[PDB]
Copies of this chain bind each other. A is one copy, B any other.
């Protein structure tokens, strides 16, 4: 229960400034059968409104604070990994292009069917506007024919301040406190 402490913290702290906390899914898709070297995953986040913030390098909006909490891999993707239908490796998580903060431990290991699934080391906080980007470093790449792209799901805790009041003073006071 590492997401739930973040959720209770975002509910408790962002309430007096006026703050709308919810949780969503982010999909990292490394397309087109990675087999040789380090590639770049297509990020795709779904916030309120069906905006579908897609493509590489999702800039956080100037009124929100994001919290990347956990990540996992779906069970047919794990079946494709262990049979050599798609590549295994790690995912490096960057902030503002320079700051490496996490390396996901070997995405074959974080299958959701295992109760002994290894998690991320920490829930990474993204401030107002900053460049979230990820990279896929493959070890033991895809070998068999008819290969499939890689997909890794993340869980984001979005704390919104845009609909509250003048959102600038609220978001800077909240990012100072929490």
- List residues of A whose CB falls within 8 A of some B CB: 1-4, 7-8, 11, 18, 20-25, 27, 36-38, 40, 45-57, 59, 61-64, 70, 72, 74-77, 79, 81-82, 84, 88, 90, 92, 94-103, 105-106, 108-109, 111-122, 127-131, 133, 135, 137, 139-140, 151, 153, 155, 157, 160, 162-169, 172, 175-176
Contacts and interface: CB of A to CB of B under 8 A. Distances in A.
Contacts of A8: 122
Give the number of copies in the complex.
10
A3 B103 CA distance: 13
A79 to B, nearest CB: 7
Given A52-B40, A115-B113, A153-B105, A168 B130 contact: yes
List the 3 closest A-B pairs by CB distance, nearest first.
Answer: A49-B97, A116-B117, A51-B97
Nearest to A69: B121
